[PDB]
Structures are given as structure tokens and as C-alpha cells.
Amino acid sequence: RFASVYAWNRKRISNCVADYSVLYNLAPFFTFKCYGVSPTKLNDLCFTN
Amino acid sequence: FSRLDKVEAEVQIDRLITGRLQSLQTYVTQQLIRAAEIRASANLAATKM
Lengths: 49, 49
Prior knowledge:
Chain B: It comes from Severe acute respiratory syndrome coronavirus 2 (2019-nCoV). This is part of a larger assembly, with two copies of chain A (49 residues). By secondary structure, chain A is low in regular secondary structure.
């Protein structure tokens, strides 16, 4: 179940190691464009939160 | 270089190289003006002496 637009949920991800390979390897992904970075260079950086 | 793909990163750095390079040409040009003033005062101290 996903929340409605007007009450969108928010989950905090921290204190973990993130692997974006499984994210970008999902077939029905259609609209995936990134602004500050490039999607192929998300696996070699550390983010604050 | 560690956040943008190589096709696009060549646009940002050129906007940074051409600024640092122009900020260094200004320094040289100002020195050429100043060195032509001391040369005008070392040719007056050589006449006073």
C-alpha cells in the first residue's frame, strides 16, 4: 500500500550501506532522471542523510 | 568529476578553467603596468645620484 498524494509518507534511511544496483536493475522503471548527480555514479559516494 | 558523467562534466570544468585562467592573466597585466612605473623611478634615482 502506498499513501495518497496529499498525505505522502516519508521514511528515514541512515546508518546503513546502500546498494543501488538492485534499484536501477528493475525492468518497469520508466521516468528516472537525476539532477545533481548521474545515476551510474551513485555507488561510490557517501551521503549525510 | 566524481558526481557527473564524462559527457557533461566537460562543460562545468571548462567554465572553471577559463575563469581561473583569466584571473591569472589579469595579475600579469597589472604587474606589467607597475613594473613600468618603478622603471620610471629607477631612471630618476639614477639621475639624482
